[PDB]
Design a protein around this ligand. Structure first.
Ligand SMILES: Nc1nc2c(ncn2[C@@H]2O[C@H](COP(=O)(O)OP(=O)(O)OP(=O)(O)O)[C@@H](O)[C@H]2O)c(=O)[nH]1
Ligand SMILES: [Br-]
Ligand SMILES: [Br-]
Ligand SMILES: [Br-]
Ligand SMILES: [Mg+2]
Length: 175
């Protein structure tokens, strides 16, 4: 048979952002290679598993937590975030009110979760629905403690493989 991988990683990753920004769609594209325009609102939280053959020696398993957009108005997001090693925070480029919610989610996450060493977790910002300022997005990341941002489309499959690759790169880098 095949030589077993040298190393296998399992990481919990959060997907957060306000109602309808595309959290579920990004996960469905990334994991199941599919999209539909039909809005099925998440109730509480749903889960998916991405297997990355990271290198010939290395598997990375990503336990994706698809959190519903109104969960930040509840009382225990602290439980949702427990043991996560990274997050995507998503907004809808067509609805600027969802961009305002990004800092709300980021502040909620950073207040309730740190790595064992007390460091904040790696977070990438996804500017989603780009199928429907570069410097300013960079400045925003530096001001709010994001490692990166990408324009994404679950519909056209833009930059979702790249954003996830770059987030896992950062999570390994703190190891
Ligand atoms: N055009 C376009 N529509 C998108 C994209 N991503 C999501 N949508 C649509 O936007 C709507 C909301 O998508 P969801 O993935 O359910 O959003 P959500 O953030 O999971 O919503 P909640 O779970 O209710 O908080 C749906 O009608 C999707 O088809 C995208 O990249 N492009
Ligand atoms: Br539809
Ligand atoms: Br809301
Ligand atoms: Br809103
Ligand atoms: Mg959803």
């Amino acid at each position: 048979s095949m030589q077993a991988p040298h190393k296998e990683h399992l990481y919990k990753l959060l997907v957060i952002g306000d109602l309808g920004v595309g959290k579920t769609s990004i996960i469905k594209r990334y994991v199941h290679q599919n999209f539909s325009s039909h809005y099925r609102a998440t109730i509480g939280v749903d889960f998916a598993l991405k297997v990355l053959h990271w290198d010939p020696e290395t598997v990375v398993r990503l336990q994706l937590w698809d959190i519903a957009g109104q969960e930040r108005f509840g009382n225990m997001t602290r439980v949702y975030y427990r043991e996560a090693m990274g997050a995507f925070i998503v907004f809808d480029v067509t609805r600027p009110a969802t961009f305002e919610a990004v800092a709300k989610w980021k502040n909620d996450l950073d207040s309730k979760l740190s790595l064992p060493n007390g460091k904040p977790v790696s977070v990438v910002l996804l500017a989603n629905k780009c199928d429907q300022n570069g410097l300013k997005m960079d400045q925003f990341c530096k001001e709010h403690g994001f490692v990166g941002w990408f324009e994404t489309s679950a519909k056209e499959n833009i930059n979702i493989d790249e954003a996830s690759r770059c987030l896992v790169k950062h999570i390994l880098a703190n190891e």
